[PDB]
Amino acid sequence: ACTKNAIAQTGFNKDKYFNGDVWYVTDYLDLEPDDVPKRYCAALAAGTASGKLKEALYHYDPKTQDTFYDVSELQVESLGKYTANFKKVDKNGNVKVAVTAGNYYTFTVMYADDSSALIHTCLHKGNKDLGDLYAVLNRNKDAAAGDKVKSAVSAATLEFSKFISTKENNCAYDNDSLKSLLTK
Ligand code: HEM
């Protein structure tokens, strides 16, 4: 179940966030912690492609090697708050599971600057959902969370000390696929 109406960043700069580049998840918090593994790798690209607002996602379980990519068109709910219906794709954008009603995530950018961000997502796959998930993002996959984004975590009435880091998993990413998937 999801329980949070995440508040988007005051003054959110959509063109800077959605600039076509890659964001790495460095730390995450699921409010239903058993919904996701305690060791995990994730990243995304975010941009406008031929006028359409898009995200490309990458997930990798470093223990099981379970890997998947997704491509989403985002619809606007309000500035910094989106609903994304996703299709599972291979790294080249070929469809493995088509867009389907009931398969969507909400996405709220609670904080962002040029290098760092805090997001919330509520994932739905049919009638289930994977609890509220918060993620600390960085442009540099090895960046420790700075004071700006940790302050944002506190401003959301969360504690950064409870977030789980992704940094000890030897995560390696295919940035080229994430960028090209934005067009798919
Ligand atoms: C747009 C930050 C994230 C977003 C937007 C996101 C989105 C998604 C989406 C769309 C799916 C379903 C993919 C599909 O079935 O085609 C998924 C599944 C999953 N995600 Fe994430 N995710 C994020 C981060 C994370 C993180 C950090 C972890 C634990 C850095 C995580 C763990 C999982 C797991 C384990 C599944 C599979 C769930 C199930 O099918 O049983 N995700 N995620």
Side-chain angles (χ1 to χ4, degrees):
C2 292
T3 66
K4 302 302 153 203
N5 178 5
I7 302 301
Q9 184 186 35
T10 297
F12 173 61
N13 190 328
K14 69 193 186 190
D15 290 359
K16 282 192 167 185
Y17 185 87
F18 291 102
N19 65 343
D21 197 6
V22 171
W23 288 104
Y24 305 96
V25 177
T26 61
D27 303 85
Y28 64 92
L29 179 80
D30 197 310
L31 299 186
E32 289 177 345
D34 294 346
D35 283 6
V36 300
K38 284 141 213 198
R39 304 318 167 358
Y40 215 82
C41 302
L44 61 88
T48 295
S50 201
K52 317 293 169 280
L53 191 73
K54 304 285 290 294
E55 286 181 343
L57 312 181
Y58 171 69
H59 283 70
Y60 178 75
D61 184 319
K63 289 292 177 227
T64 62
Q65 301 193 58
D66 195 52
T67 305
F68 49 97
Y69 290 90
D70 293 87
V71 174
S72 311
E73 321 147 291
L74 273 57
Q75 295 311 135
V76 179
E77 304 310 335
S78 57
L79 182 65
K81 198 159 183 85
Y82 309 94
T83 305
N85 286 97
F86 51 89
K87 53 181 178 193
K88 186 182 280 184
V89 295
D90 67 18
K91 71 172 229 253
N92 292 320
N94 311 300
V95 176
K96 296 182 81 162
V97 185
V99 166
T100 314
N103 281 7
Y104 68 96
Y105 58 98
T106 69
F107 190 85
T108 303
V109 182
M110 298 160 58
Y111 168 82
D113 67 18
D114 298 280
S115 296
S116 65
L118 175 64
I119 72 88
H120 174 275
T121 180
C122 184
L123 173 65
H124 301 262
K125 327 181 92 186
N127 328 241
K128 350 291 230 103
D129 144 275
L130 272 310
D132 300 86
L133 181 79
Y134 298 93
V136 167
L137 311 180
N138 203 277
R139 295 298 194 184
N140 165 7
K141 69 176 186 69
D142 295 306
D147 277 324
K148 227 153 167 207
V149 76
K150 289 191 42 177
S151 294
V153 171
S154 181
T157 312
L158 302 171
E159 296 282 327
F160 183 72
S161 57
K162 300 167 182 336
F163 283 59
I164 303 187
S165 183
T166 61
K167 82 191 166 171
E168 299 200 42
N169 299 320
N170 285 167
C171 302
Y173 307 88
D174 183 350
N175 272 33
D176 301 305
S177 292
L178 283 170
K179 288 177 156 164
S180 60
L181 279 175
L182 288 175
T183 74
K184 304 297 186 287

